[PDB]
Design a protein around this ligand. Structure first.
Ligand code: CLA
Ligand code: CLA
Ligand code: CLA
Ligand code: CLA
Ligand code: CLA
Ligand code: CLA
Ligand code: CLA
Ligand code: CLA
Ligand code: CLA
Ligand SMILES: CC1=C(C/C=C(\C)CCC[C@H](C)CCC[C@H](C)CCCC(C)C)C(=O)c2ccccc2C1=O
Ligand code: SF4
Ligand code: SF4
Ligand code: FES
Lengths: 72, 738, 144, 95, 165, 39, 61, 80
């Protein structure tokens, strides 16, 4: 098949696009992902939060840059 | 050998089964345990195929059913005439059809509904009827409300007779199957007698009653001044006065010198300008022509003598090479399935009603009718809706037949068979063409509005911008404009001003004018076309795969209506032709709403108004606003909304009331449209816990509706809300502005 | 009784040819063929749509999916009491003319039939999914 | 009560069955051991064949009209409405 | 007065909009005869308007800047300032009739649950028993409080439950 | 006749007649006693 | 066990008539895991009004 | 592939087997019920989960229970 959703080969084995759809739909339901261990999942959500924060800071900094650039 | 075959005292008469719910069917007769029992009981009350298997008894059932139907209609017409005779200002409006609004409904002096008894002229206090009974009766020449009184009375009597007829023919003497099957006999009978005689008698009433009295009306004599109709029948003196051909009586007709009778069989065309109605001479000539036609027509088929024809024989004869068995066995089919004839007649009748409304607004026959813009619009929209619904019912019962009565064993290689074969290619091509239509016709308006918001109107599609001129329609219009010259030498005027020509004015109101066709109208026509093609698509899919599909090879086994076949293999949700005709209802409503919008706006803009130039209601704004949907919404809807959104404190205030209420109910439908009967039954279980908690459970087990039933409830409420909203808006707007 | 074989040289019943016919999947993955001998010649209906006439005795038809042949078996077995035997075929040419192929028919008890997938227990005796947690995949409690 | 003559593989046994009692229940109360499984009118285990007399099996769900017209009866949900004769152990003859 | 609400028996906008109403009335009225049914109806309408207004003024309704009556919701306040006749008594009558109807409903329900044909009595009704329970249902509150003191109203913990409770 | 009585004791017709009775009650009430606001 | 026609209260949780009462049609004397035959008056969401039961799932009430 | 399971309440009236349009069921000898018959699913990989079995089992809880699983071309009922 396709490495479709590596975290879920069961989905990666669908010969339809529903493979794609559900691989999206479950990209972040690690509790259902394959072979997930507890501490692993913990670190996973850890990095998830990390990226979340990075997102926020990027948003704010871009706002401020662009206003300083093109505002009154 | 055609004759009369009946059975005496087949059915008895007792109120016994009246005390017995569900007696007609097997299962329902067992009585209710859960709540769906009552629902299904109601649902199947008139499914006589479900009732039993006797073709003959089912025929008798539907026969009595028609009897009762006619009786209902009699009741309604009679009550209409009754309230016209008793609670109307029709005689006032006879004295002045130019400044009295037809009104026949008065309400009671109660908590405040009384405000609605507004002023329609002639000191009358009621509600303006948009039905046009006034112009109808004037065309027919009714003068004294006594006449309407007599009319309503006779209608009561007729209804009673029809209901007794149903009773007798069901319980006392019910005909036999072969008698029901003497089809060519029935055709000849109907075709000749019913239509020809009706038309001919109407023509006689016209000639001897209406044309004289309407002639005097337009002459201007007081209504209460004309002699009585039977007095006219007595005294050929006055008839010859009106038209000297009558001095010679009928001997000229017996000498084939029809030319002399021309005084009352004209070929003017056009309207009576002082009246806006068609030329009554021309109307009578029309009807007598129709009469002779159907009369000579009713003698086509053999019944009990060597001469005639055989439907079967001719149908078998008509076969082509590419087609195999041609038109064979269809005789057998139609002789056997009620739903076949049903669906046929329904489709035909819907189409008719559409054409009826078309020609009616095209060439209004009734006196001063064209002035009543509201009545025009109302009857038109009315009959259009009726026709579309008849179409979808046709599709419904056709699919019903295909489920139930179908049999391959008799149709081996017929038109039906090859259709069943290449249905896939057929439907494929249909999909493709509908998709192309939608794309182009919709994107036109969208690109227009896009260039507009983009400030590039130069790049739109307008009669000023890049144009799409219906050269065809305009060329044909001029063609009809010039036809009477040579292709109709004995003609005086074209049948319609919209072929071209002048404007007719009665009382300042624009009665009729020639109508041009712009790229806007091009676009709207193409819209309509695309929508109708979608509707025929969904219907055709439903009917073609009603019995089977590459998905469901055994679909014929699941009955006509059925919720689904599970969520298995992906999910079988909404897989019945029942569901298909459901969807079709939706798309049809969409289509006809669009069409009536087109009609209303174009009328208001380029047709209606008041003469002085033409004070067009919306000043032809449509011409340049219709190319863009922004113009559409604002200039049509937002503009004409004022009448309804400020109608309060007026007699028309109920229009805005029902406007908002229709909004309400139309949204109410959506909970059904979206919800889930499983969820519902879950809530049912919760609440029955609540009840039993107080020993207040009902014996009949409460049950959530079937998937189908929920679908039906929702769609009914939805269509109701939409049509009512639009109805209110139109009525208020036109009563205010016209 | 013994497993029969398939004979590709069987006069297929009389039908004019439809458009609900076989597809790529037949030439690619597999396709099934149905085998039955009718007592007489008679018209019948095609599950994929259409009216067809079967020949006397040996008659053969092929399909892709299983449900086609299964519904067809129902039709003949309940309308003409025939006992067809339809197989599983692949583009390899390998047959397995199997769809109810099992000596007799499964609707009656038969010696030799070993129970499978049968939870020798009630259904309410299943355990909460909190226990199937952290397995190698999504597994239901009733899986055990 | 109605006399129900049961024509069984062991011979004939005539039992009395009240109008309000199912054939199968009366047979068991009389000490006979007729076939059954679902006892709900939804299978063929308890099939018999009425040779004469009438039954009311209106709540049955498994048999079609032609089967009942040939006398087949689901004894677990059938009441006698007359003295009747019923061959038991008829499931095989239904198939 | 309360919340700065002046009586419309005192308020100006009250009489203002009243006169405005009568003005619209006479305006629609001025297009007829006198004996005309529309004329006499409009006159009766004016009469009804003025009468309703005199009644509203006599009721002592606090009617604010709109001159329109606003209602008060406090037992203490309504009692202290003579305004129970607007909420208190209406609510009391409502609850009376409502409890009556519900009680007699349950009475018939229990009577028919004590039957062999529950469905058939649920469809077709016992006319005389209905009339009897209707006549007797006045003492519904005393009966109910009696059954409460006996604790016989409510069903015990035997009704069906869901598996997870 | 008894058949007729049973037909009248059928449910929806009874619901009908009771509703008609109540509604006519209240309409006559408003007729003779127009414009109720308090008490 | 209980007598035929007798009234028992059903205790099998997964049953429609759970926490309710039924009528013992009969009880088998063979080795069946559920010999109690008990009718019901209200039907289930399947419409059935009678189900088989072991002895414990019911109680004579 | 979907999942199907048999439970002791099988009265063996076969309606399940009688209902499976895919022959994913069959009856075997047994001794738990009077019918001495147990339902059996040897061809689960053919079940499309159309559950008509579950519809047919007259059993209080369905002597049989379906559980939709992954998707194969046969599971989806595709003929293409
Ligand atoms: C009050 C008079 C009366 C009475 C007592 C009956 C009695 C009956 N009618 Mg009705 N029926 C009557 C007048 C009457 N009918 C009328 C006026 C018509 C003409 C529309 C019919 C048309 C009619 C039909 C078409 C049918 C009945 C049927 C019935 C039966 C069940 C009624 C529920 C019963 C024999 C049903 C019946 O007999 O089913 C077998 C049935 O199919 N009646
Ligand atoms: C079929 C059409 C029809 C309709 C829609 C109405 C509508 C109405 N009728 Mg009825 N009515 C009709 C025919 C109709 N009637 C006929 C055929 C009869 C004979 C039984 C009557 C006899 C009748 C009377 C005697 C009265 C009404 C009245 C009414 C009004 C209140 C009820 C209402 C506007 C009342 C009315 O018009 O009050 C002003 C009223 O007094 N109607
Ligand atoms: C809830 C109060 C109420 C009540 C008890 C009535 C009572 C009545 N209305 Mg209705 N009616 C009401 C509100 C009410 N109406 C409202 C809010 C509207 C606006 C849609 C109408 C609009 C209305 C009309 C237009 C007519 C009636 C008519 C009638 C009478 C015959 C039926 C009846 C006395 C009919 C009447 O008076 O016939 C003479 C009639 O024609 N009513
Ligand atoms: C279909 C209805 C109908 C009826 C009931 C009558 C009735 C009558 N016609 Mg006839 N008539 C009719 C159609 C009818 N006519 C038609 C369609 C024509 C056109 C050919 C005529 C042309 C006609 C003439 C020219 C005369 C009659 C005459 C008469 C009267 C004597 C017979 C009588 C009142 C005679 C008469 O007395 O007229 C007043 C007479 O002279 N009719
Ligand atoms: C103008 C007079 C006239 C004449 C000469 C005929 C001549 C004939 N009619 Mg008659 N017929 C006519 C008008 C006429 N009809 C009219 C006005 C009616 C009443 C609506 C009918 C209704 C009628 C029927 C229903 C039938 C005939 C039939 C016939 C044919 C056999 C008898 C015969 C050719 C039979 C036939 O087969 O006609 C085609 C037949 O069954 N006619
Ligand atoms: C001439 C009018 C007419 C008649 C006599 C019938 C007759 C019938 N319709 Mg209805 N039906 C009609 C028009 C009509 N229909 C129209 C216009 C529609 C479109 C909304 C439908 C759509 C429709 C559906 C979708 C169904 C019926 C059904 C029925 C049956 C039960 C009542 C019965 C055969 C039900 C049925 O079982 O039909 C066989 C059913 O499900 N009809
Ligand atoms: C199906 C109808 C249709 C047609 C025939 C055209 C025709 C045209 N579009 Mg398109 N256009 C359409 C729908 C359509 N458009 C829709 C639905 C939109 C909304 C997204 C647009 C938005 C759009 C833009 C923004 C532009 C065009 C442009 C064009 C030109 C073709 C390049 C031509 C004027 C180009 C243009 O302006 O050419 C002059 C262009 O820039 N169109
Ligand atoms: C693709 C299918 C299609 C359909 C169903 C219609 C439908 C219609 N066209 Mg045609 N039309 C189409 C595409 C289509 N048109 C396209 C793409 C063109 C450009 C070549 C035209 C150009 C065209 C003209 C010029 C006219 C019509 C007209 C009409 C009407 C009568 C024929 C009808 C609404 C006539 C009409 O009534 O226009 C308003 C007319 O005069 N069409
Ligand atoms: C639904 C809740 C509710 C609310 C929000 C109010 C609001 C009010 N009540 Mg109370 N009241 C209520 C229900 C309510 N009441 C009910 C159901 C009763 C019937 C026993 C009363 C009986 C009552 C009396 C007899 C009096 C008030 C008073 C008041 C007002 C000032 C006291 C206060 O804030 O009480 C807060 C509200 C509550 C604590 C809700 C429970 C009410 C209990 C049952 C009685 C409360 C009496 C109250 C404490 C008396 C204070 C008197 C004050 C002069 C010191 C105030 C508008 C007084 C008043 O008119 O002041 C102008 C007053 O004299 N109420
Ligand atoms: C609300 C809702 C329900 C619940 C509502 C139901 C079942 C309708 C209830 C109708 C009435 C209110 C119940 C019958 C009342 C009796 C006649 C008792 C007498 C009442 C008197 C007032 C006459 C569904 O079951 C449902 C099912 C499928 C799709 C959508 C829905 C849906 O939207
Ligand atoms: S799930 Fe579908 S295929 Fe499987 S046994 Fe049930 S009905 Fe048959
Ligand atoms: S699942 Fe139900 S129908 Fe199928 S064998 Fe078991 S008890 Fe009989
Ligand atoms: S034992 Fe199943 S129907 Fe009688």
């Amino acid at each position: 098949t396709k490495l479709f959703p590596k975290f879920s080969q069961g989905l990666a084995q669908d010969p339809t696009t529903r493979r794609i759809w559900y691989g999206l739909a479950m990209a972040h339901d690690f509790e259902s992902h394959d072979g997930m261990t507890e501490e692993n999942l913990y670190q996973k959500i850890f990095a998830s939060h990390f990226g979340q924060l990075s997102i926020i800071f990027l948003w704010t900094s871009g706002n401020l840059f662009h206003v300083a650039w093109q505002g009154n | 050998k055609v004759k009369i075959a009946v059975d005496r005292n087949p059915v008895e008469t007792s109120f016994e089964k009246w005390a017995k719910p569900g007696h007609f069917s097997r299962t329902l007769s067992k009585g209710p345990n859960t709540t769906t029992w009552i629902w299904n009981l109601h649902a199947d009350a008139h499914d006589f195929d479900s009732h039993t298997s006797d073709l003959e008894e089912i025929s008798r059932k539907v026969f009595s059913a028609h009897f009762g139907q006619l009786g209902i209609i009699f009741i309604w017409l009679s009550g209409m005439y009754f309230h016209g005779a008793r609670f109307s200002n029709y005689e006032a409006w006879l004295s002045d059809p130019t400044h009295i609004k037809p009104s026949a409904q008065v309400v009671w002096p109660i908590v405040g509904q009384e405000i609605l008894n507004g002023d329609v002229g002639g000191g009358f206090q009621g509600i303006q009827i948009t039905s046009g009974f006034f112009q109808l009766w004037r065309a027919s020449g009714i003068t004294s409300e006594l006449q309407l009184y007599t009319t309503a009375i006779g209608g009561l009597v007729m209804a009673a007779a029809m209901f007794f007829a149903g009773w007798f023919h069901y319980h006392k003497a019910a005909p036999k199957l072969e008698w029901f099957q003497n089809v060519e006999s029935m055709l000849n009978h109907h075709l000749g007698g019913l239509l020809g005689l009706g038309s001919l008698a109407w023509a006689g009433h016209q000639i001897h009653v209406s044309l004289p009295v309407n002639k005097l009306l337009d002459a201007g004599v007081d209504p209460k001044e004309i002699p009585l109709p039977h007095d006219l029948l007595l005294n050929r003196a006055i008839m010859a006065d009106l038209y000297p051909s009558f001095a010679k009586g009928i001997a000229p007709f017996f000498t084939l010198n029809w030319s002399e009778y021309s005084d009352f069989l004209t070929f003017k065309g056009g309207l009576n300008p002082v009246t806006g109605g068609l030329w009554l001479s021309d109307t009578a000539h029309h009807h007598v022509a129709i009469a002779v036609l159907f009369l000579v027509a009713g003698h086509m088929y053999r019944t009990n003598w060597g001469i005639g024809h055989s439907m079967k024989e001719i149908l078998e004869a008509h076969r082509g090479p590419f087609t195999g068995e041609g038109h064979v066995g269809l005789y057998e089919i139609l002789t056997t399935s009620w739903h076949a004839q049903l669906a046929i007649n329904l489709a035909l009748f819907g189409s008719l009603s559409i054409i009826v409304a078309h020609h009616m607004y095209a060439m209004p026959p009734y006196p001063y009718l064209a002035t009543d813009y509201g009545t025009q619009l109302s009857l038109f929209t009315h009959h259009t809706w009726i026709g579309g619904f008849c179409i979808v019912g046709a599709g419904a019962h056709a699919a019903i037949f295909m489920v139930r009565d179908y049999d391959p064993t008799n149709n081996y290689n017929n038109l039906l068979d090859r259709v069943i074969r290449h249905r896939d290619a057929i439907i494929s091509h249909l999909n493709w063409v509908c998709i192309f239509l939608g794309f182009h016709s919709f994107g036109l308006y969208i690109h227009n509005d896009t260039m507009s918001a983009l400030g590039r109107p130069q790049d739109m599609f307008s009669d000023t911008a890049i144009q799409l001129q219906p050269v065809f329609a305009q060329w044909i219009q001029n063609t009809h404009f010039l036809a009477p010259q040579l292709t109709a030498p004995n003609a005086l005027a074209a049948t319609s001003l919209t072929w071209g020509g002048d404007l007719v004015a009665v009382g300042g109101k624009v009665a009729m004018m020639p109508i041009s066709l712009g790229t806007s109208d091009f676009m709207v026509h193409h819209i309509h076309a695309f929508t109708i093609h979608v509707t025929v698509l969904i219907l055709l899919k439903g009917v073609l795969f009603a019995r089977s599909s590459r998905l469901i090879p055994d679909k014929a086994n699941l009955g006509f209506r059925f919720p689904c076949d599970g969520p298995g293999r992906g999910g079988t949700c909404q897989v019945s032709a029942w569901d298909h005709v459901f969807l079709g209802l939706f798309w049809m409503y969409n289509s006809l709403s669009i069409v009536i919008f087109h009609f209303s706006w174009k009328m208001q803009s380029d047709v209606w108004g008041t003469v002085t130039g033409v004070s067009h209601i919306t000043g032809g704004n449509f011409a340049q606003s219709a190319n863009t949907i922004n113009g559409w919404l604002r200039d049509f809807l937002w503009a004409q909304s004022s009448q309804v959104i400020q109608s309060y404190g007026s007699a028309l205030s109920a229009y805005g009331l029902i406007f908002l209420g229709a909004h309400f109910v139309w949204a109410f439908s959506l909970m059904f449209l979206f919800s889930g009967r499983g969820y519902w039954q879950e809530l049912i279980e919760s609440i029955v816990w609540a009840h039993n908690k107080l020993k207040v459970a009902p014996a009949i087990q409460p049950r959530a509706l079937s998937i189908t039933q929920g679908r039906a409830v929702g769609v009914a409420h939805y269509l109701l809300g939409g049509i009512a909203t639009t109805w209110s808006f139109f009525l208020a707007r036109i009563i205010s502005v016209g | 009784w013994t497993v029969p074989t398939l004979n590709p040289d069987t006069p297929s019943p009389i039908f004019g040819g439809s458009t609900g016919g076989l597809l790529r999947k037949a030439q690619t993955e597999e396709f099934y063929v149905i085998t039955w001998e009718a007592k007489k010649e008679q018209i019948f209906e095609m599950p994929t749509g259409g009216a067809a006439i079967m020949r006397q005795g040996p008659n053969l038809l092929k399909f892709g999916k299983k449900e086609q042949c299964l519904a067809l078996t129902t039709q003949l077995r309940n309308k003409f009491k025939l006992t067809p035997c339809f197989y599983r075929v692949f583009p390899d040419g390998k047959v397995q003319y199997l769809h109810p192929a099992d000596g007799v028919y499964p609707e009656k008890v038969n010696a030799g039939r070993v129970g499978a997938n049968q939870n020798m227990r009630r259904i309410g005796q299943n355990v909460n999914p909190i226990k199937v947690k952290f397995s190698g995949r999504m597994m239901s409690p009733a899986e055990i | 009560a109605y006399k129900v003559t049961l024509k069984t593989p062991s011979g004939d046994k005539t039992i009395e069955c009240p109008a309000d009692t199912y054939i199968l229940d009366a047979a068991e109360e009389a000490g006979l051991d007729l076939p059954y499984s679902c006892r709900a009118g939804a299978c063929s285990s308890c099939a018999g064949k009425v040779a004469a007399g009438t039954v009311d099996q209106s709540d049955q769900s498994f048999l079609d009209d032609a089967q009942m017209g040939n006398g087949f009866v689901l004894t677990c949900v059938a009441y006698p409405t007359s003295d009747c004769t019923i061959q038991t152990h008829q499931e095989e003859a239904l198939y | 007065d309360i919340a700065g609400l002046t009586p419309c028996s005192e308020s100006k906008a009250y009489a203002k909009l009243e006169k405005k109403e009568l003005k619209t009335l006479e305006k629609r009225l001025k297009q007829y005869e006198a004996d005309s049914a529309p004329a006499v109806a409009l006159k009766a309408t004016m009469e009804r308007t003025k009468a309703r207004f005199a009644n509203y003024a006599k009721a002592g309704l606090l009617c604010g800047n709109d001159g329109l009556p606003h209602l008060i919701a406090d037992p203490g306040l309504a009692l202290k300032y003579g305004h129970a006749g607007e909420v208190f008594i209406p609510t009391f009558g409502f609850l009376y009739v409502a409890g009556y109807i519900g009680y007699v409903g349950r009475q018939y329900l229990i009577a028919v649950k004590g039957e062999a044909k529950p469905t058939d009595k649920e469809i077709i009704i016992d006319v005389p028993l209905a009339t009897k329970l209707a006549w007797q249902g006045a003492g519904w509150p005393l009966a109910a409080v009696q059954e409460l003191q006996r604790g016989t109203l409510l069903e015990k913990e035997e009704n069906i439950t869901v598996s997870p409770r | 006749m008894k058949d007729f009585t049973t037909y009248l004791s059928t449910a929806p017709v009874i619901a009908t007649i009771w509703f008609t009775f109540t509604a006519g009650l209240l309409i006559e009430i408003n007729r003779y006693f127009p414009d109720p606001l308090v008490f | 066990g209980p007598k035929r026609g007798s009234l028992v209260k059903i205790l099998r949780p997964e049953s429609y008539w759970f926490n309710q009462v039924g009528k013992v049609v009969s009880v088998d004397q063979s080795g069946v895991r559920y010999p109690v035959v008990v009718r019901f008056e209200n039907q289930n969401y399947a419409g059935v009004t009678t189900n088989n039961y072991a002895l414990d799932e019911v109680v004579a009430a | 592939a979907h999942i199907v399971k048999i439970y002791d309440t099988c009265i063996g009236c076969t309606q399940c087997v009688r209902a499976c349009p895919l022959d994913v069921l069959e009856m075997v000898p047994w001794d738990g019920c009077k019918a001495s018959q147990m339902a059996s699913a040897p061809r689960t990989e053919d079940c499309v989960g159309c559950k008509r079995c579950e519809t047919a089992c007259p059993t209080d809880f369905l002597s049989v229970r379906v559980y939709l699983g992954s998707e194969s071309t046969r599971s989806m009922g595709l003929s293409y």
